[PDB]
């Protein structure tokens, strides 16, 4: 969710800011985050950029103690020498992907604009296999695997969690045998 | 002005309209239906079922809850949708197979999902048309729907005995994929028992999908019970697990021709529901196998023949001589035209055939273009020749005051592989838009034939179970002064006979009088040296105000005797009018001349 001061809808424009509000929201979509503490449910932020600047990602003071930004060096927008901008954020946790209009749930209050949200923390995965052998005796196998993430969590934690869920599935489907 | 169009054409109040999309998961008697269309058409039934819930007392509250569609039950839509079929409706309905019923099914989004093998009945394409839907609301209507309307019963062509749902390019491609014959691969030359050992040995990669193996299988010799050692391949076994156990076993390369032959034999031997289940399952398996084979197209697939660079060159010198010959003028201009077009056609053919053979032999197991051509999925020798050989010849039409006719002296020798010079591409645009204009004008011409000849006729029905008229036609086969063009077989088939017939070989009654003549009997008769036979004609019916059941004969929509109470006339009208669109002295003039008792003026 976003609440800009002096703009009421997704097609306005702010004096002295080189981009639309649409592009502000669109590129705010792309900023990947991280925790530092567990139990952080949802958070609201207040940015007051009030100086002759170029407004960038890490320029976001992760002013809430509960949370931080990984990618600091992204260009939100180019201000002029004189633009004054006030923004308010909401960051929340989730899975998979959700579109905008479902996020209309949270009380627009004539100002709030809901935005899309891509939650997935993974970017690329690999596995490959190839035989290895001793003379005359076979059945040696190489599995080589690669995990490429956003940095919000090391590969080991995610890999462990995936296996935990998969074993949790097969557990019931092997032991318990309720019958018709 | 008043009493013709809008006196009958109308508004409707339980209809809907939207766009259609191909269905690769549903059965033959189901359709995919966006959630809101279904949430709206069925609204009154839903309203009653909320009423019978007891939770609501007022239809106003029910409307309030069905409009805003809040987190309450769609279970009622799921239920009601399950026994309350829906009529799918095309806009330009030509013959009845443009209107059907279906069992509807929820899907995601805002598009109508429809099964791939039914559209050919609609004779439509998937450009994005906006099919209409209707809801019956009365149980007599719904019974007529799910008893006569429903698609699974409507598999034949009322025009004539052809089947309507011949499968398409991709299924025939997959089936052609499974049933080839490669000499030496995984697990050549071993022994099985049929099902168990074959499925085991394939399922453990000890034999690939395809290798010539010898196996012990059961097939009926007319019609019994021989179990021998056939040489075949897993694959053909997998499909022949599904060909019903009343015809025997299938051993050929399974093209399109053969697929139609088989679907015909199975329908004629065992009936409609059976042939339906067969066609559905063959769809599914061949379609999955075509996918898992991973078939695609590449440049390296298409080998231009080396000799083309030779051959295209070579004719030049021949052309050169026939140039210099006409240079010394002994030869007339038009015959120069004729000779050069002949030579270029010769080289075109000798390139095309060598092209196609080289295309065949590179793997014999696969060449995307080669199998797409030969399996009859889609393509032709001509298209593929363009994709790898000269464009051929093209006409000099001159587009006005000329027949066209005489064609360019120089063929378009470059093929689409290499690219075209500017002038050739200009000539191609010339000819192609010529063809498009020709098609547009032909469609315009056919429109009037269609409308008038559909407006030929309208009338009433047949009305008796027999017509007593033991004075029928002497039916025989017609041969037009060089050969025979129309067979007695279909001319005799399905038409009640008069006198019990026996073979010239002694003591074999072939028919009992007043019996439905059958395909087997028809074949026996054709083999016999009998010449003609006496059968009834809808004409000679004694029964006034109609025609007798036995007068007419086979139903042609099912494969049964026509029964009491069904209108034949409008069927005959539609079936005789619709082919007018292809009808290109012929045409409308002669047809209306003969119907309307006009003088030939000659």
């Amino acid at each position: 969710a976003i609440k800009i001061e002096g703009v009421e809808h997704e097609f306005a424009t702010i004096p002295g800011v080189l981009e639309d509000v649409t592009n502000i929201i669109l590129n705010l979509k792309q900023v990947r985050f991280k925790q530092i503490v567990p139990n952080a449910d949802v958070e609201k932020a207040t940015i007051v950029i009030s100086n002759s600047e170029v407004f960038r990602a890490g320029d976001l003071n992760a002013q809430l103690s509960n949370f931080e930004v990984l990618n600091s060096n992204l260009v939100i927008c180019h201000l002029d020498k004189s633009a004054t901008l006030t923004m308010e954020f909401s960051i929340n946790k989730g899975r998979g992907y959700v579109s905008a209009e479902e996020n209309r749930a949270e009380h627009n209050e004539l100002s709030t604009i809901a935005i899309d949200s891509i939650y997935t923390p993974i970017r690329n995965v690999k596995y490959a296999v190839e035989n290895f052998r001793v003379e005359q005796k076979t059945d040696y196998e190489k599995l080589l695997m690669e995990v490429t993430t956003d940095g919000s969590i090391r590969p080991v934690d995610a890999l462990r969690e995936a296996a935990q869920i998969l074993i949790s599935h097969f557990s019931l489907f092997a032991e318990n045998k309720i019958a018709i | 002005g008043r009493f013709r169009q809008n006196l009958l054409g109308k508004r409707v109040d339980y209809s809907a309209r939207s766009v259609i999309v191909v269905g690769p998961e549903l059965k033959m008697h189901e359709c995919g239906l966006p959630k809101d269309m279904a949430a709206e058409l069925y609204k009154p039934f839903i309203i009653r079922k909320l009423i019978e819930r007891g939770i609501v007392k007022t239809v106003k509250s029910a409307k309030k809850i069905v409009d805003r569609k809040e987190p309450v039950i769609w279970d009622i839509l799921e239920y009601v949708m399950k026994g309350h079929p829906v009529l799918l409706n095309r806009a330009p309905t030509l013959h009845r197979l443009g209107i059907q019923a279906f069992q509807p099914k929820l899907i995601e989004g805002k598009a109508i999902q429809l099964h791939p093998l039914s559209c050919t009945a609609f004779n439509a394409d998937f450009d994005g048309d906006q099919m209409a839907v209707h809801l019956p609301l009365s149980n007599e209507a719904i019974l007529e729907a799910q008893l006569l309307m429903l698609a699974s019963h409507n598999i034949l062509n009322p025009a004539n005995g052809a089947p309507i749902t011949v499968p398409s390019q991709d299924m025939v491609l997959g089936l052609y994929y499974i049933t080839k014959l490669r000499p030496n691969t995984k697990g050549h030359g071993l022994i099985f028992y049929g099902p168990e050992e074959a499925t085991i040995a394939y399922n453990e990669g000890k034999v690939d999908i395809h290798a010539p193996i010898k196996v012990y299988v059961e097939d009926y010799e007319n019609g019994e019970l021989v179990r021998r050692m056939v040489e075949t391949s897993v694959g053909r076994l997998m499909v022949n697990e599904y060909v019903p156990k009343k015809v025997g076993y299938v051993n050929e390369v399974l093209g399109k021709k053969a697929l139609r032959d088989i679907i015909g034999s199975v329908i004629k031997i065992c009936g409609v529901a059976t042939t339906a289940k067969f066609l559905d399952d063959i769809k599914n398996l061949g379609y999955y196998m075509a996918f898992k084979g991973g078939l695609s197209f590449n440049l390296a697939d298409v080998l231009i023949p080396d000799e083309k660079d030779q051959l295209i060159q070579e004719g030049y010198t021949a052309v050169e001589q026939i140039m210099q010959d006409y240079s010394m003028g002994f030869i007339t201009f038009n015959e120069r035209y004729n000779q050069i077009i002949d030579t270029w056609t010769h080289i075109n053919g000798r390139l095309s055939n060598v092209l196609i053979k080289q295309l065949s032999s590179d793997n014999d197991g696969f060449n995307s273009v080669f199998m797409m051509m030969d399996s009859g999925a889609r393509g032709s020798k001509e298209q593929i020749r363009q994709l790898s050989g000269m464009r051929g010849l093209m006409a000099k039409p001159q587009k006005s005051g000329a027949e066209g006719g005489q064609i360019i002296e120089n063929p378009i020798l470059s093929n689409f592989k290499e690219g075209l010079s500017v002038l050739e591409y200009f000539i191609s645009t010339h000819g192609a838009r010529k063809g498009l204009a020709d098609t547009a004008l032909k469609t315009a011409d056919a429109g009037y034939l269609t409308r008038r000849l559909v407006d030929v006729s309208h009338d009433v029905i047949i009305t008796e179970e027999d017509c007593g008229t033991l004075r029928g036609l002497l039916t025989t086969e017609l041969k037009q002064n060089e050969d025979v063009v129309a067979s007695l077989y279909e001319r005799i088939l399905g038409r009640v006979s008069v006198h019990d017939i026996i073979h010239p070989t002694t003591g074999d009654i072939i028919v009992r009088a007043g019996e439905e003549i059958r395909e087997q009997a028809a074949q026996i008769i054709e083999d016999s040296p009998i010449e003609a036979v006496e059968i009834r004609s809808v004409l000679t019916c004694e029964s006034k105000k109609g025609v007798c059941a036995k007068c007419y004969g086979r139903n042609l929509a099912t494969n049964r005797m026509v029964q009491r109470g069904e209108v034949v006339g409008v069927i005959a009208a539609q079936s005789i009018g619709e082919p007018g669109t292809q009808l290109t002295t012929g045409g409308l003039p002669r047809v209306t001349e003969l119907f309307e008792a006009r003088n030939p003026s000659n």
């Binding site: 997704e10 | 009958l8 766009v19 191909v22 149980n139 991709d170 078939l295 002038l423 010339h430």
Partner: protein, 1184 residues
């Protein structure tokens, strides 16, 4: 931002030694020939509006004592701006003024007075600087119209009763057409307009040829046979008859026939042949008399009848129609000329009428001319004529092809009832003049053929196009002198072709060269090629010369590909096609949709709403100074086009930039970085996936809905007029009866929806509540229910409610002008006088600085002598009329230096004259602003008081059912949105995004798409982008070299894997990158259904159309279908209760909801109507 600021790779095989002729030559060239804003001091030699006036005026009496004459017009600046016209709904037009000379001569005496009056004779719409007119708030175009060339033409018509009938045709510019045709009896007949036969001997003796024996003597059996069937045989009786068989039962006077024939063949003021008509007459007839009467002469008739008999006896050849040299062009200027001249001409007719009777001292030009007829005719031509059309204004390419559209319907060319196959066709001579490949099929195949790029219009209506001179082996210079040529001369010279490889020295490099000489098509020796096409990219139209990799494609595929480009929706963030041809860039430049830099300088200020540029100051120092000069260009930020596809722009220069002339400040509206950007690059794979790509459908990955490179915006407009009624006043108020407070929440207190809300269908948009007491039958009902509090009171609730199926976001709602500035201050004269005196004070002070500037900034010059000038100039400056002493400049001190330069003081002071003239213009416009502001205000429809409006915009994504396309014909529709996992993913973890069916490919010969795919994959690392000319593109070996150097399979193939099974698809699949477009048939507007709905008041049938849902036409054919099978209750309930029984429908509905599904069908009203409409008589209907 470190923007890429990248430069593409050209790849050709030959130099490009000839540029792009600009696009907008035709429209803006013509209109700037016709009229311009201001200063025609000494202009328009010879053609122009001045030619109109010197051809029509002066108008005098029947030698009676009174005359009118013309004194030059001035052309006035527009009263309102383009944008303000668009917003308001007016027309961008300029007022016109002319100094009419009344010249009253004393009755039966010498002259009485010789006076001039300034006449404002009406507004005429003006051309925005792109060739488009905003009429009533819409933007329209005058399309061109191919023409018939006047002159003489020769055709032996055939099959007319089998016999050959040669007809010669004389074709004027205005008037009737003349024919000379042979009868079946080999008898020769002359007549008019191809009409009924009339003997040529009869017309000959109608001209004044003597007795028939002498006619034979001067003309000698075709003429003899004509005499044999001639019903007249001597002069007097000859014309007596020739008038008799023109009308029946009316007299056949000789003298009337003499006058008729004389005016038919020899009247200058009754026969109107254009100079082009005279030219064609002269050339086809090989005549040597160009300057003469524009009308037929006797020698012309003699020569035409001689050539007529010469081609009657089969000694010549017929003419051709589709030949382009027989069609002219008549650009917008010519046809506006024609209508204007007609209007003024019969205006002169009626002024002749008025002044034929002429008193004195009672007529001054104020009452002489009711010229408003000129207003009528011109406004009608621009508002209703055949050729003026709305604009397909959804896509830059759509316009820039829309403005060289070349229609052929209506007067000027052939007619829709005269075309055979040729006007449906592409002739042998459309080469370069008229597009071969874009003549879109349908009802208009040949009719609306479009113009090539290099095509240029000569001065006669001949389409011309460049060639490069060629002689004796060289390209004569390749080149220094281009030779534009017209169609007519082309027909005898061998024209070589460009893709016949050259050195970079002007030499052909083979023995055989391809050429077209006659309508034949040979392969010539380069020892006699005489002239060469400039660029082999010539023979494609503008949208046709944008296809990558053409020479490997089908014609028809390219046709529909172009027709799909023409409607490509403007995306939300386009992307340069990393493959293209070197024509983008220029094409955005010709479009004036981007804020171009006017003059060099640095940029003070940039935002997305205004670009504030300090231009170069140097212009004011060949001056001394006059004022500050900084421009502020404002931006197109979201606005609705015709087709609802919004337009937007974004600046592309930074706060310290210095910008040169010809620079593009802004990107957007399908433009990026100065390049034409329609679609996106994407990863695609060619493999039939689960058969969801059965036919030419398509398969999508979830990234593509997540990357949002397939998204757009739409917006539409809602209007509502409130009106003075005959019985009440209409209102825009919030007090809407019977509606709920929530439906008013989005409404402001001013009865309209505020900006900043979302709309659910059915809610109020514009609150219109109107106490229209037109119910003169008991308005006490008005009062009775208007005092209840809800005030329905026959006070009609006309509050427009949100259409069903519409959801969106509210933009800005205007209120326009509401009939009165006088609305406060408890006074009328007080407020108006306060406003006038404020006007006066800032007038006087601004003009005071204006006087100071003109005075102290003019005195600087090297004029020598005593001062003598400051005080006199000041006292003149106190009461500047600005004309008395403007040129004099006190006429002494500047005159002391007899020799002087250009008089920079004169330059400065006429600049001040201009600046105060414009200042007075806007200040008097401000005056009329306020004055009419206390009135109805802006130009508003007479019978209504106000019109309100709202804007609604919708942000639209992709979903199943939407249509997609590409640049090679691949139309398709989305079938399934696949999750990213189980897309077939290559050996490096990247799942493909689009999967396409290989089946559709090898039957429609368009393997250009896979070539594009391989290159765009070999580039997306990314290495440098590409650019190749159409028919000189990238060869295959070089393709292979790049694919190698990018680290790829040299063959375009690869292996692939399945998510779900890991299997390696045993045959290698093809993968690549391709360019992809979204078309405008979005499925969100193909949804409708209905169960129950509102009922009509003329029949118990509920209409439909998604304006109100309704149903579909249950037509005749499905009546026949339910006939064919045994429809028991289906058909009966369709024709009885499903429709057209509101009583039965209500009963059946209430029964279905009430638990009785058994109907009781009765008798439709159609039969009730039948008994009622038959009318019975003395009535005998039945009860049995």
């Amino acid at each position: 931002t470190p923007t890429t600021n990248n430069k593409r790779i050209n790849f050709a095989s030959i130099k490009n030694p000839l540029f792009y002729p600009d696009f907008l030559e035709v429209q803006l060239k013509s209109f700037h020939d016709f009229l311009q804003l201001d200063t025609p001091p000494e202009r328009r030699k010879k053609e122009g509006l001045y030619k109109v006036f010197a051809e029509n005026f002066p108008i005098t009496d029947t030698r009676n004592n009174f005359v009118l004459e013309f004194l030059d017009y001035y052309i006035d600046p527009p009263k309102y701006s383009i944008e303000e016209c668009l917003s308001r709904g007016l027309t961008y037009s300029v007022p016109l003024k002319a100094k009419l000379k009344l010249y009253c001569t004393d009755p039966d005496h010498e002259d009485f007075a010789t006076v001039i009056q300034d006449v404002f004779l009406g507004p005429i719409p003006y051309m925005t600087s792109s060739g488009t007119f905003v009429i009533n708030g819409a933007e329209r175009v005058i399309v061109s119209q191919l023409h018939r060339s006047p002159g003489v033409f020769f055709g032996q018509s055939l099959h007319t009763n089998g016999t050959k009938l040669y007809s010669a045709r004389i074709i004027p510019f205005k008037g009737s057409w003349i024919e000379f045709a042979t009868d079946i009896n080999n008898v020769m007949y002359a007549y008019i307009d191809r009409k009924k036969k009339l003997p040529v001997t009869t017309l000959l003796r109608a001209i004044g040829f003597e007795a028939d024996k002498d006619i034979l003597d001067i003309f000698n059996s075709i003429i003899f046979n004509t005499l044999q069937k001639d019903p007249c045989n001597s002069e007097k009786e000859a014309l007596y008859y020739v008038y008799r068989q023109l009308r029946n039962a009316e007299p056949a006077d000789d003298a009337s026939a003499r006058e008729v024939i004389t005016n038919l063949f020899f009247s200058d003021k009754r026969y109107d042949l254009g100079d082009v008509g005279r030219y064609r007459i002269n050339k086809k007839l090989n005549l040597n008399i160009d300057p003469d009467i524009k009308v037929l002469t006797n020698e012309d008739i003699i020569e035409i009848i001689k050539y007529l008999i010469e081609l009657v006896n089969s000694k010549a050849s017929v003419d051709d129609i589709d030949h382009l040299s027989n069609r002219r062009v008549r650009t917008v200027g010519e046809q506006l000329y024609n209508q204007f001249g007609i209007g003024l001409a019969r205006m002169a007719r009626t002024v002749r009428d008025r002044m034929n009777v002429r008193d004195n001292e009672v007529f001054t030009p104020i009452d002489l001319v009711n010229a408003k007829t000129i207003s009528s005719v011109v406004n009608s031509f621009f508002g209703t004529n055949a050729l003026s059309q709305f604009m397909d204004q959804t896509n830059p390419l759509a316009e820039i092809t829309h403005k060289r559209r070349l229609s052929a319907l209506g007067p000027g060319g052939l007619s829709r009832e005269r075309a055979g196959f040729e006007v449906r066709d592409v002739h042998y001579t459309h080469y370069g003049r008229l597009c071969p490949i874009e003549t879109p099929e349908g009802p208009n195949i040949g009719l609306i053929s479009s113009l090539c790029v290099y095509a240029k219009i000569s001065d006669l209506g001949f389409i011309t196009t460049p060639y490069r001179e060629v002689k004796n082996g060289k390209v004569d210079f390749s080149d220094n002198g281009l030779k534009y040529y017209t169609a007519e001369e082309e027909e005898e010279k061998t024209v070589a072709q460009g893709n016949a490889p050259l050195d970079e020295n002007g030499r052909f490099v083979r023995e055989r060269v391809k050429a077209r000489y006659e309508s034949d098509f040979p392969l010539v020796t380069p020892d006699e090629v005489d002239l060469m096409d400039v660029s082999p990219t010539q023979i494609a139209s503008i949208a046709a010369a944008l296809i990558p990799f053409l020479e490997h494609d089908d014609a028809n595929r390219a046709l529909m590909g172009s027709n799909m480009m023409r409607q490509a929706v403007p995306l939300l963030r386009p992307e340069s096609p990393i493959v293209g041809t070197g024509i983008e860039g220029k094409l955005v430049k010709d479009s004036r949709t981007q804020i171009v830099a006017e003059r060099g300088g640095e940029v003070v200020f940039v935002d997305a709403s205004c670009i504030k540029i300090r231009y170069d100051r140097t212009a004011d120092e060949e001056f001394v100074s006059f004022d500050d000069a900084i421009v502020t260009y404002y931006l197109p930020k979201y606005r609705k086009t015709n087709q609802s596809t919004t337009i937007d722009l974004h600046p592309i220069c930074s706060k310290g930039d210095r910008v040169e002339a010809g620079q593009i400040l802004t990107e957007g509206y399908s433009t990026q970085g100065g390049e034409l950007a329609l679609g996106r690059n994407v990863q695609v794979a060619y493999m039939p996936w689960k058969g969801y790509n059965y036919e030419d459908a398509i398969v999508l990955n979830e990234r593509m809905v997540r990357e949002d490179f397939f998204t757009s915006v739409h917006v539409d407009e809602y209007i509502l007029e409130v009106r003075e009624t005959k019985r009440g006043l209409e209102e825009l108020t919030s007090d809407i009866p019977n509606v709920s407070e929530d439906a008013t929440r989005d409404l402001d207190e001013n009865g309209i929806v505020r900006i900043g809300a979302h709309i659910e269908p059915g809610d109020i948009l514009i609150g219109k509540i109107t106490p229209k007491g037109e119910s003169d039958p008991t308005p006490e009902e008005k009062l009775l229910r208007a005092i209840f509090g809800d005030k329905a009171g026959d006070v009609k609730d006309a509050s427009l409610k949100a259409t069903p199926s519409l959801r969106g976001v509210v933009i800005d709602t205007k209120l326009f002008s509401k009939a009165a500035k006088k609305k406060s201050r408890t006074s009328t004269k007080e407020a108006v006088s306060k406003l006038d005196e404020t006007y006066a004070k800032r007038q006087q002070q601004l003009h005071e600085r204006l006087i100071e500037k003109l005075t102290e900034l003019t005195k600087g010059k090297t004029c020598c002598g005593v001062k003598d000038y400051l005080n006199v100039e000041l006292i003149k400056a106190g009461s500047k009329f600005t004309k008395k002493d403007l040129e004099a400049l006190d006429f002494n001190v500047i005159q002391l230096s007899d020799w002087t330069n250009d008089a920079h003081t004169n330059e400065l002071i006429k600049a001040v004259a201009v600046n105060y003239l414009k200042h007075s213009k806007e200040i008097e416009a401000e005056l009329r602003r306020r004055k009419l502001d206390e009135t109805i205000g802006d130009e508003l429809p007479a019978g209504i008081v106000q019109m309100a409006k709202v804007y609604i915009a919708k942000k639209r994504k992709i979903q199943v059912g939407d249509k997609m396309a590409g640049r090679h014909g691949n139309k398709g529709i989305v079938s399934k949105i696949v999750r990213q996992e189980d897309m077939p993913f290559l050996a490096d973890g990247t799942p493909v995004d689009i999967c396409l069916n290989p089946l559709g490919v090898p039957s429609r010969m368009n393997l250009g798409q896979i070539f594009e795919a391989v290159l765009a994959w070999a580039g997306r690392k990314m290495n440098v982008k590409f650019a190749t000319p159409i028919f000189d593109g990238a060869s295959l070996n070089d393709m292979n070299e790049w694919t190698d150097k990018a680290g790829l399979p040299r063959d375009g193939k690869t292996y692939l894997y399945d998510g779900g099974t890991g299997e390696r698809f045993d045959q290698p699949a093809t993968v690549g990158v391709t360019y992809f477009l979204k078309l405008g048939h979005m499925v969100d507007d193909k949804m409708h259904a209905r169960s129950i709905g509102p009922y009509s008041l003329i029949t118990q049938q509920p209409l439909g159309g998604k304006a109100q849902f309704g149903g579909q036409r249950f037509g005749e054919m499905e009546v026949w279908a339910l006939e064919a099978f045994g429809a028991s209750h289906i058909l009966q309930e369709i024709l009885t209760v499903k429709s057209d029984d509101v009583v039965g429908r209500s009963k059946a509905y209430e029964a279905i909801v009430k638990g009785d599904p058994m109907p009781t069908p009765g008798i439709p009203e159609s039969l009730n109507v039948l008994l009622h409409e038959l009318k019975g008589l003395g009535l005998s209907f039945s009860l049995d």
